[PDB]
Swiss-Prot record:
Catalyzes the transfer of the enolpyruvyl moiety of phosphoenolpyruvate (PEP) to the 5-hydroxyl of shikimate-3-phosphate (S3P) to produce enolpyruvyl shikimate-3-phosphate and inorganic phosphate. Gene3D superfamilies: Enolpyruvate transferase domain. The gene is aroA. Its main location: cytoplasm. The active site is at residue 313. It catalyses: 3-phosphoshikimate + phosphoenolpyruvate = 5-O-(1-carboxyvinyl)-3-phosphoshikimate + phosphate. InterPro entries: Enolpyruvate_Tfrase_dom, Enolpyruvate_Tfrase_sf, EPSP_synthase, EPSP_synthase_CS, RNA3'P_cycl/enolpyr_Trfase_a/b. Pathway: Metabolic intermediate biosynthesis; chorismate biosynthesis; chorismate from D-erythrose 4-phosphate and phosphoenolpyruvate: step 6/7. This is 3-phosphoshikimate 1-carboxyvinyltransferase. Residues 95-98 are annotated as: Phosphoenolpyruvate.
Length: 434
């Protein structure tokens, strides 16, 4: 039977907590380690449903991966570029868009056939953005309506291409870069606007040769095993940053959070809105830092377009900050929100309205009038970020907030409840319905 989250207001957040590992880096780290030469130890690996689904898919194809769940460690025995074997069944990517799209680039150049699918939500997510450029490289992929299930007819004779991406997308950049490694010649990717660069950084880590305003790679190289340490996901920290910002009497520090510039959006915008956030204890191994957050009053803002891409996954929780800020906040150029786990614009607008916030939808964003969150009930729409965003909303709401169906929070933040309660934000898992 289902599980829901139930909150009561917070009298202030307090403490030091280390959020778990970065989802984005975790996906790439395990996929690259799998086809490298040698043994790679991965610390800080995110033991969430999405990342574990990536592991599981790789295992269907003969990757040698040892999962040590309680310590967030993976031990990967590389099988080399050509070491994978044809799986017997369709690869279940669960709820993970990153897995299915990155796997597609890895499997495009294989000498075997693969069927990629997932859960209902994943079967509604768009794939044209990868199918077209892969097809230019020589890939043949079958799909009804440019959505999974995808059937890849492996082609070991893929050829490189130069390609400009229509919109900024790390997933597409990463997909092509992977297929690039198995393609004859150079593959050059040019972005109109920078997207997160984790792939590029891991490729350098595994000593694969990389060129550069666009970035290129030549096929036939080899990845060399090299131990990896994953920093904390700032997307997970985003929930505590917003909560401590909006909840009076709050003072907290978030240890070992990744601070890659292509991920600092939530922080940049909150600051524009009046936030009190201090980055210190800065270090390098992917950049990492300690984030200290204190309560501050906020003013609504017009979200500059250039920040949208770097903050796409943080709008759910940011919109909770806009809801309790003074004045109006307008989000634009965020039509990508509609095509995620769920339509995140529709889902936030509905939740906010149910909690008493004047929130109006736009095809590419929302208009929010800062106001006062009331207690009530909202639906997560099975989306992990919608669920946690509303759990953050509970800290300031006038009354309890019931968020329905929170089983998917583990897709990116398995220990969310435990850490929430530990810093003083009240959230309890309780028997759901249906």
């Amino acid at each position: 039977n289902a599980m829901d989250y139930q909150t009561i207001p917070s009298q202030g957040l307090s403490g030091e907590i280390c959020v778990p590992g970065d989802k984005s880096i975790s996906h790439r780290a395990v996929l690259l380690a799998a086809i490298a030469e040698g043994q790679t130890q991965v610390d800080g690996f995110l033991m969430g449903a999405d990342n574990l689904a990536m592991v599981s898919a790789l295992q269907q194809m003969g990757a040698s991966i040892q999962v040590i769940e309680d310590e967030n460690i993976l031990v990967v025995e590389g099988v080399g570029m050509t070491g994978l074997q044809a799986p017997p069944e369709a690869l279940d990517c669960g709820n993970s868009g990153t897995a299915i799209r990155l796997l597609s680039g890895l499997l495009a150049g294989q000498p075997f056939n693969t069927v990629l699918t997932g859960d209902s939500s994943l079967q509604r997510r768009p794939m044209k953005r990868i199918i077209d450029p892969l097809t230019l490289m020589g890939a043949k992929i079958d799909s009804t309506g440019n959505v999974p299930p995808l059937k890849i007819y492996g082609n070991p004779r893929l050829t490189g291409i130069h390609y400009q991406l229509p919109m900024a997308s790390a997933q597409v950049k990463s997909c092509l870069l992977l297929a690039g490694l198995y393609a004859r010649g150079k593959t050059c990717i040019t972005e109109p606007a920078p997207s997160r660069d984790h792939t590029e950084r891991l490729l350098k880590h595994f000593h694969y040769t990389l060129q550069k305003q666009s970035i290129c790679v030549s096929g036939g190289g080899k990845l060399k095993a090299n131990d990896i340490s994953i920093p904390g996901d700032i997307s997970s920290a985003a929930f505590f940053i917003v909560a401590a910002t909006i909840t009076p009497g709050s003072a907290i520090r978030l240890c070992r959070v990744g601070v890659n510039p292509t991920r600092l959006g939530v922080i940049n915008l909150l600051k524009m809105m009046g936030a009190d956030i201090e980055v210190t204890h800065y270090t390098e191994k992917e950049p990492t830092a300690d984030i200290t957050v204190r309560h501050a009053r906020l003013k609504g803002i017009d979200i500059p377009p250039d920040q949208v891409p770097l903050t796409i996954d943080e709008f759910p929780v940011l919109l909770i900050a806009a809801a309790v800020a003074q004045g109006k906040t307008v989000l634009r150029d965020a039509a990508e929100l509609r095509v995620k786990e769920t339509d995140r614009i529709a889902a936030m607008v509905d939740g906010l309205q149910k909690l008493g916030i004047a929130a109006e939808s736009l095809p590419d964003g929302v208009i929010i009038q800062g106001g006062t969150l009331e207690g009530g009930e909202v639906n997560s729409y099975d989306d992990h970020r919608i669920a946690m965003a509303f759990a953050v909303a509970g800290t300031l709401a006038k009354g309890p907030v019931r968020i329905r169906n929170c089983d998917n929070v583990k897709t990116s933040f398995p220990n969310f409840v435990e850490l929430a309660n530990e810093v003083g934000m009240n959230v309890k898992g309780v028997r759901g319905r249906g």
